[PDB]
Every structure is written in C-alpha cells, then in structure tokens.
Design an enzyme around this catalytic site. Structure first.
Site, short mmCIF file in Angstrom:
data_model
loop_
_atom_site.label_atom_id
_atom_site.label_comp_id
_atom_site.label_asym_id
_atom_site.label_seq_id
_atom_site.Cartn_x
_atom_site.Cartn_y
_atom_site.Cartn_z
N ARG A 216 35.45 30.20 71.07
CA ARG A 216 36.88 30.04 70.86
C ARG A 216 37.27 30.27 69.40
O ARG A 216 38.34 30.82 69.13
CB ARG A 216 37.32 28.67 71.40
CG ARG A 216 38.71 28.23 71.02
CD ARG A 216 39.77 29.12 71.67
NE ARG A 216 41.03 28.92 70.94
CZ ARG A 216 42.15 29.62 71.03
NH1 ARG A 216 42.21 30.67 71.84
NH2 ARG A 216 43.15 29.27 70.27
N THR A 341 40.62 23.89 82.55
CA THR A 341 39.76 22.96 81.83
C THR A 341 38.32 23.46 81.82
O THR A 341 37.64 23.43 80.79
CB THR A 341 39.81 21.57 82.46
OG1 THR A 341 41.16 21.16 82.67
CG2 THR A 341 39.12 20.57 81.55
#
EC number: 1.13.12.7
Length: 541
Positions: A216, A341
C-alpha cells in the site's frame, strides 16, 4: 489466454524492503528532522502536531512496550475516535511487530467484546470516553492486563497515560533517534487485525500482514493510483481510522510526509472552511457524505481552488451521486474504487485522469483481477458479467481463528472471490453491478427492489427485508422478499402481501410472496446479496 486476466501496471515506486514499521520509521525520521513539518491537524481544536513530536512519541511507545514485554506474539487494541493520538500506539506497535486491532470510542460494549474476543489483546489503549466500556469488557476478558489512556498527560482515574507509561518503562538514557525497529518477517507477522462487519453474522477478524501495508505504501506514492508527493500537500480526512480506508490512507500519508487534517464529527461549515483555510488538496468521505454534499448549496461560498480530489476509497458510488458531487465542487470527477477489509484497501481505483463514466477504476499495481462464470467458475471475457475475483499481495492472510471462512473465500490459487458482480470493458475499466439498479420486471413493468424494501421496513413488525425477483415463466419475475420479523412479533405471508398491495400500484405487488429468514443475506461490502435472496425463495416454493 488469459488475455482475460486484467493486470495492474508496473508500480511507479518499487516495493521497498523492510517491515511496515521499518518503512514508516525511516520516512517519519527524515520528516522529524525538519522542524515544523505537520503530520496531523485536529480541525475541531485547531492543534497541529509535527512529525518530530509524532516520531519521538511513537518511538518511545515502541521501546516502552518492548520493555514491558510485548513482541510479535501479542496484540494491542487501540480504541478511540479519530484523534491526534490515534496513530501513536499504532505506529509504536508496528515498530516492534505487535499486532494492532483498531476499535472506536463509541462502539457499544457488545461490539467491543466480540471484536476484542477475536483479537485477544494484552494491552488496550483507550481514550477517556471509552474507558468504562473497556473496563467492563476487561472483567469478561482477563487477557487484558493493562489499560492506557490516550488523550491525557497525567494519569487518569488511576490508569497511566501514554506519557507516564512510556516513563515507567523506558531505559535510563533512551535516545529516540538511536532506536531501531524490530526486523521480522513481513509476510507472517500481523500488522493489523481489522473488523469485518461484513457479510452475515458476527464481524470477523481480518488479519493483515506487514506486506499488505508495504504494498500500500507503493500505491500511496503512485502518480496514477495514489498521491503525487508535492510539498505542503494536505488531506482532509473524514473517514474512521479503524476501517481500511482511513487506516491505510493515513499510514501512506505519513510515508509521504503529508499534513493529515482530521474531522471526527462531521459539520458542513467546519468541513468547507477547513477545505479552504487548510488549502486541502484531497478530501476523503464515507459514501453517505457524498449524498450529503450533492444537496449542499454552500460550496460556492468558499475558495476551494486548491482542491484537486474527493475520494471514496473502496466504496463504489452511483454515477448520479458522483457526477453531482463533482459538479458541486467543480471537479472533472471523483476518485472511486473497490476494495474490501480482506483486501486491505482499494484494489480497483480510478486512475488519475483516466476516468470513465460509471467505472469504479482499474486494477492496481501488484494485482490482477478477473470475472468468472457463476456456475463454472471459468474466466469470462470482455464486457461479460460474472463474479469479481482478485489476486495480490494485499489479500489478508485470513480470518483470525477461522480457516473455514478463509478457505471458503480464497481458493487454492490465491484468488479472493468477492461475491460481487462485475465486468470490465475494452480499456480495462471495471464496473461494479449495483443491486439497487437491478429492476424486477413483471409483465413489462419494472420496480426497484429498494422501493419495496422501504415499504416493508416501514411495518412495525418487520425488522429487516430483502427484495428480489422470483422467476415464474408465466410472468417474468414476481417480486418477492425475505423478511426478518421483529423479535416477539408474529406475521403471516398473506399479511405482508396484503400490506404491500395496499401501498403500491398493481404492477409492483409482491406476488412472489414472502420467506421468513433470520437474516437478510449480505455480501462482503454489506449490501444485500440478491443472488442468495433469490436462491432462498426458489428453494422455498
């Protein structure tokens, strides 16, 4: 071939070596050394906190936890609304490989218990307004040895603050700028345990290894899929830190040296005035704040000339709401995406510039995505609709103490099966099929399921409902519903059908009938699961 797998482009910034704690420590240390660089700003109390303050306290919390006894075998909970303090214990734990499970100040005791029953934390960081609930949960979960108050300097009601706790345990001559974070295996050491919501039943614990964060951090820097690192970039973030959107934008913003301006209570004027006065480049919103701003008439009052981007993260938005919000803010569009999630954050993302009407975005670097036939599981081709499946280094390692739910979701080849319906077009743009726009079709006449669902949720004895079309033959579809009765109440199918008929035109009647269930099937996003609703009523009659 398998030219039918949609693959993300090469990242602008290669995946860097190190744990997530190490890459965060390294970036923030460099920003700590430039006095006055602002990490977080609280829009309500107007206090800024610098990278130097933020790095020094996080480093101190890491060593204090290490000396207290915590290592990769322990987990902490951080239980707090968004705040200047939220990320101090989070960063401290990551530096030493302790797993972090976020929770909010205002979750009820029942929600906290189940969340923390899964994460089983040794140490809890809580804000003052969450203390009593954590105390009450502690007597039911005795693995909780120590409670530490986040938003205090002195001790608070007998409990230590982060500041006194650090002081109890740091070695005599501790040096924040000599500290070195734990090195450990990023693939198996768990960085975050995120709560699920998600599908039906209890929220599960999504375990995310440090690798997902490190991937990320490549996205956060990307000029196409993230934010270009210009100096004096400021974000106005109005999304909870304890879901994936807020957790992993923020961690990436810290990597990038940005100023993160926080709002934990939404207010229209404060939001707009903060966009203007803080010269915000990017704003983050929960999806129903997009609908709010489609209605706002005050936006033209403010100088928003620095505003470049409004984003929704992993939440897809209708074409109507997005265009309306872009138009109110004089933007060419908004940044959309799709994630779970279980994927850490968005894995489809609107590429900068490369936006297409109604598209949710494109596959992110390091990832591949496909659509599969709902019966054969075979990979479909262009513009064909099937189940969306994704594969990449941001997929969770699994649900905490539930390999059954894990293996049912991720296959032997590492494809996560989303439960959602999508297609991609010739330019590799993806589109998420929204259940709300799948109309039920009775002898020519069409009705939105959510219209009937609204009629049903109106009834005092109906607690929840899901509407889909029952295939008939004679007929096309007959509108039909799964109904969750309110505890205590008794209703018959004919009762419910008579009630609907008395509120809708004859075409919109619930001729398919009613099937009483205990819960309306939901997908991983939380939206209703039309395919399963249909299955239930077919099986029933």
């Amino acid at each position: 071939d398998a030219k039918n797998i949609k693959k993300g482009p090469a990242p602008f910034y290669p995946l860097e070596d190190g744990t997530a704690g190490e890459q965060l420590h390294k970036a923030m240390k460099r920003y700590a050394l430039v006095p006055g660089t602002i990490a977080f700003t609280d829009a309500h109390i107007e206090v800024n906190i610098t990278y130097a303050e933020y790095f020094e306290m996080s480093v101190r919390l890491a060593e204090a936890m290490k000396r207290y006894g915590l290592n990769t075998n322990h987990r902490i909970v951080v239980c707090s609304e968004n705040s200047l303090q939220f990320f101090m214990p989070v960063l401290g734990a990551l530096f030493i490989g302790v797993a972090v499970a976020p929770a909010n100040d205002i979750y009820n005791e029942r929600e906290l218990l189940n969340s923390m029953n899964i994460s089983q934390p040794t140490v809890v960081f809580v804000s003052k307004k969450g203390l009593q609930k954590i105390l009450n949960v502690q007597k039911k979960l005795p693995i909780i040895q120590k409670i530490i108050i986040m938003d205090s300097k002195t001790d608070y009601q007998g409990f230590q603050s982060m500041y006194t706790f650090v002081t109890s345990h740091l070695p005599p001559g501790f040096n924040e700028y000599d500290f070195v974070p734990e090195s450990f295996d990023r693939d198996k050491t768990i960085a975050l345990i995120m709560n699920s919501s998600g599908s039906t039943g209890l929220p599960k614990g999504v375990a995310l290894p440090h690798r997902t964060a490190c991937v990320r951090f490549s996205h956060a820097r990307d000029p196409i899929f993230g934010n270009q690192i210009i100096p004096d970039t400021a974000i106005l973030s109005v999304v909870p830190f304890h879901h994936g959107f807020g957790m992993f934008t923020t961690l990436g913003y810290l990597i990038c040296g940005f100023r993160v301006v926080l709002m934990y209570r939404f207010e229209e004027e404060l939001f707009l005035r903060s966009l203007q006065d803080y010269k915000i480049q990017s704003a983050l919103l929960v999806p129903t704040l997009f609908s709010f701003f489609a209605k706002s008439t005050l936006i033209d009052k403010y100088d928003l000339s620095n505003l470049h981007e409004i984003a929704s993260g992993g939440a897809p938005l209708s074409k109507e709401v997005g265009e309306a919000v872009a138009k109110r803010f004089h933007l060419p569009g908004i940044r959309q995406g799709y994630g779970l999630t279980e994927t850490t954050s968005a894995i489809l993302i609107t590429p900068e510039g490369d936006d297409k009407p109604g598209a949710v975005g494109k596959v992110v670097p390091f990832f591949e995505a496909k659509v599969v036939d709902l019966d054969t599981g075979k990979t479909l081709g262009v513009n064909q609709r099937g189940e969306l499946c994704v594969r990449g280094p941001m997929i969770m390692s699994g649900y905490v103490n539930n390999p059954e739910a894990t293996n049912a979701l991720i296959d032997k080849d590492g494809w996560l099966h989303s439960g959602d319906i999508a297609y991609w077009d010739e330019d590799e743009h993806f589109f998420i099929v929204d259940r709300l726009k799948s109309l039920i079709k009775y002898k020519g006449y069409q009705v939105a399921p959510a219209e009937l669902e609204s009629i049903l949720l109106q009834h005092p004895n109906i607690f929840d409902a899901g509407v889909a079309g029952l295939p008939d033959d004679d007929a096309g579809e007959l509108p039909a519903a799964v109904v969750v009765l309110e505890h205590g109440k008794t209703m018959t199918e004919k009762e419910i059908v008579d009630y609907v008929a008395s509120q809708v035109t004859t075409a919109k009647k619930l001729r398919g009938g009613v099937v009483f269930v205990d819960e309306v099937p939901k997908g991983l996003t939380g939206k209703l699961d039309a395919r399963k609703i249909r299955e239930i009523l077919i099986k029933a009659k």
